[PDB]
């Protein structure tokens, strides 16, 4: 539904997925990083009912669903559910088919390599995106905040990476990764 | 008997005066680099809102 072949941006956290197009100041829509599945035996015939629900569908029908998060502490392990979320996100609600738009994804610098590799593989092989770029949260946070220099303490849902940047340069020896995030605060 | 002390004290003064006059002539002839500059500031008092950049 867009009138320009801008890049797409999709911030796939362990909590929620914020997505929209590049050049804007906000995601156009926010979806949970969830694929839901029924935990009950169907009783009635001709009720429709999906084998799995995606994003906002998973929360909307959650009364009888178990809701799973494909991403654990920032890393995707269930790529199949990620593909479902992305297809819904890009084609049904954001109305941007990746085939016609380059796509940028986000991740902690110490997020294990499989995350950036699998996300890149899926956008190129199941979505046919013309181009890809996996960006680092510390970089992204300083740009959003109007800084080139500072400490990015991302107290997000998954893992906190705590990464210092000076004059645009990484200072990797000073990174303190902490296994504490919003999901644990909720559990407490 | 005093002719030489006069001449010797004078030779010392003429040389010292020469050497000092040479460094004084340049000291007095040009003096801008030996001074200072305003070194002003920005303040941004006209910053009534956000900028056109995606970063603002």
From Swiss-Prot, chain A:
Function: Actins are highly conserved proteins that are involved in various types of cell motility and are ubiquitously expressed in all eukaryotic cells.
Listed name of the protein: Actin, alpha skeletal muscle
Modification note: Oxidation of Met-44 and Met-47 by MICALs (MICAL1, MICAL2 or MICAL3) to form methionine sulfoxide promotes actin filament depolymerization. MICAL1 and MICAL2 produce the (R)-S-oxide form. The (R)-S-oxide form is reverted by MSRB1 and MSRB2, which promotes actin repolymerization. Can be mono-ADP-ribosylated on Arg-177 by SpvB of Salmonella spp. This modification blocks subsequent polymerization and leads to cell death.
Subunit organization: Polymerization of globular actin (G-actin) leads to a structural filament (F-actin) in the form of a two-stranded helix. Each actin can bind to 4 others. Interacts with alpha-actinin. Identified in a complex composed of ACTA1, COBL, GSN and TMSB4X. Interacts with TTID. Interacts (via its C-terminus) with USP25.
In-chain residues carrying the UniProt-annotated modification N6-malonyllysine: 61
Subcellular location: Cytoplasm, Cytoskeleton
Residue list for modification N6-methyllysine: 84
Residue ranges, annotated region (Interaction with alpha-actinin): 110-123
Chain positions found as N-acetylaspartate: 1
UniProt similarity note: Belongs to the actin family.
Organism of derivation: Oryctolagus cuniculus
Modification sites for Tele-methylhistidine: 73
Superkingdom of origin: Eukaryota
Note: In vertebrates 3 main groups of actin isoforms, alpha, beta and gamma have been identified. The alpha actins are found in muscle tissues and are a major constituent of the contractile apparatus. The beta and gamma actins coexist in most cell types as components of the cytoskeleton and as mediators of internal cell motility.
Annotated positions of the ADP-ribosylarginine modification: 177
Modified residues (Methionine (R)-sulfoxide): 44, 47
Curated annotation (Swiss-Prot), chain B:
Residue(s) carrying Phosphothreonine: 27
Originating organism: Homo sapiens
Endpoints of the signal sequence: none
Family per record: Belongs to the troponin I family.
Assembly with partners or alone: Binds to actin and tropomyosin. Interacts with TRIM63. Interacts with STK4/MST1.
Residues found modified as Phosphoserine: 12, 45
Post-translational modification: Phosphorylation by STK4/MST1 alters its binding affinity to TNNC1 (cardiac Tn-C) and TNNT2 (cardiac Tn-T).
Protein name: Troponin I, cardiac muscle
Involvement in disease: Cardiomyopathy, familial hypertrophic, 7: A hereditary heart disorder characterized by ventricular hypertrophy, which is usually asymmetric and often involves the interventricular septum. The symptoms include dyspnea, syncope, collapse, palpitations, and chest pain. They can be readily provoked by exercise. The disorder has inter- and intrafamilial variability ranging from benign to malignant forms with high risk of cardiac failure and sudden cardiac death. Cardiomyopathy, familial restrictive 1: A heart disorder characterized by impaired filling of the ventricles with reduced diastolic volume, in the presence of normal or near normal wall thickness and systolic function.
Whole sequence portion shown: 155 to 210 of 210
Main function: Troponin I is the inhibitory subunit of troponin, the thin filament regulatory complex which confers calcium-sensitivity to striated muscle actomyosin ATPase activity.
